[PDB]
Write a protein that binds this ligand. Sequence first.
Ligand SMILES: O=c1ccn([C@H]2C[C@H](O)[C@@H](COP(=O)(O)O)O2)c(=O)[nH]1
Ligand SMILES: [Mg+2]
Lengths: 224, 224
Amino acid sequence: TILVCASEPVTVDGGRLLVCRSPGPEGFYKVPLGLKVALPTGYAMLVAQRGGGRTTNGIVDAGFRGEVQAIVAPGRPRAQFYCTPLRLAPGIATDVPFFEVFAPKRDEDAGYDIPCPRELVLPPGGAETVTLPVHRTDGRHWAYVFGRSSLNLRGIVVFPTPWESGPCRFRIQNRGAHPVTLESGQRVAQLVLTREPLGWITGRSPFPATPRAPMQHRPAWLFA
Amino acid sequence: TILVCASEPVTVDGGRLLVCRSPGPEGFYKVPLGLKVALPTGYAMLVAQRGGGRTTNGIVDAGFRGEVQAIVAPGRPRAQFYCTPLRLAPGIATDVPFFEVFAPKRDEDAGYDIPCPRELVLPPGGAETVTLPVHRTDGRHWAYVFGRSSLNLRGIVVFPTPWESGPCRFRIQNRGAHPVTLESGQRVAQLVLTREPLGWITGRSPFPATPRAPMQHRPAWLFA
Ligand SMILES: O=c1ccn([C@H]2C[C@H](O)[C@@H](COP(=O)(O)O)O2)c(=O)[nH]1
Ligand SMILES: [Mg+2]
C-alpha cells in the first residue's frame, strides 16, 4: 500500500497515477504534479509522460516526501504524466563485486549511483556512450540505468537503458546550451533493480514514454 | 477508509471520485461508472452529475458490492459523475417517534424508507408535494429526502430536499411518458441523515448537480 496525499485531481489508471497539466514550451524545468507519495521501503516510482516525448524519466524513492514533479525538455505545451510504482529487487549477480562499481545506497533509496568511469566533455547536442567494466552473470531480476534528477534538470539526459547482458552501458546526451564536463568519478546516472521488467525501456531514446497498458504486480493506493 | 475496486479510470478530486463517461441521449437508464465500493458501516455515497442537469441523485449504501451506476434522464451525450461519501448520523430528534413515519432500516442500508401517505396519480410531466406529519426538534444533524433507485429508473423523480425546519416535505415528478399511480403505503422516497450538510441541496430541482468544491472531511479511498 502506497500512501498518496493530493492537492490536485489525480486519475488512477490501470494501476498507475495519471495527471494532466499544461507546462510551457520551454525547458528544462520542473512541472509539479500536485501530489506526494509515501512509498514503502523496497518501492520506487517512475515518473514519465503519457503519450509524448518531452519528459525525462524520473525516479522517486521511498524516502521522498516532497511534491512529485515531472522534469520536461523544451516541447509542445500540453502533457500527461504517468507514475508507476516499481517493486525493487535486492540485487543482481555480477562478475565483479557489485559495490566496486556502483555506489552503496540506503534501503530507502531507489537506485545505486553510477560514477563516470572517465572524464566526458559533451558539447551542446553531443552524446557519448558510457560503458562500465562489469557484466551480469545471470538473469534473476531486471536492472535499468536511469538519469539523476540533478542532471535531468540541466538537460544532460541519460537514456533510460536496460541491462540484462554484456557490460553496463548507457548513452548520455547534452541537450543544454553550454558544453558540459563530467569528471571521472562524478555520479552521472543510477542503476535501479526491479522485480518485474520495464518492457518499454530500450536505451535508444532520451524521453521514453510509459505505455498506457496496465501493470502486472499492481499495488494499492491510499488517498488520504 | 472506503475501498474502491476500479475496472476503469477513476479521478480522485478534492475528496470525491470523478468519472467521465459517454452515455447515450436516451433516458432513463443506468450508466456504469467502472467501480465498486465497500463503504464501511455508517457510510453512504451520493452519486450525481458534475456540471450538467441530466442525472438523478443516487445513494450507494454500505452493503452494496456491485458496480456503481448512475441513473440518468434523457439528454446531452456527455457526462461527468461525482461520487460523494456520506457519513451517516445515527438519528435525528423529532416531535413524534421517528419510526412511526420512517420505515426501519439495516445498518448496512443507508436510508430510511418513506411510505407514501396517500395515493398519488401523476400525469406525465406532473409533480406533487408529499408532506409527512413530523417535525424536527433541534438541528443536531442533517436530513435529506432522496429518491429510491427503483423509481428514478422509471422517470418518477423525487427532488433531493433538505429538512431543517417544518415538516418532512418533498416534491416528486413523473417525467415519464405515461401516467403513474403511487399507492398509499408504497415506498416512494428515502430519508438520509448525515453528519455534514449537503449545502447545495434545495428541494426545488429534479437533478441537482454536485458542485466542484472539495469537501470538509475528505475520507480515505483505497484502490485495490
Ligand atoms: O443503480 C443502483 C441502484 C441501487 N443501489 C443500492 C441498493 C440500495 O437500496 C442502495 C442504497 O440506498 P439505501 O437502501 O440505503 O437506502 O444501494 C445502487 O447502489 N446502485
Ligand atoms: Mg435505492
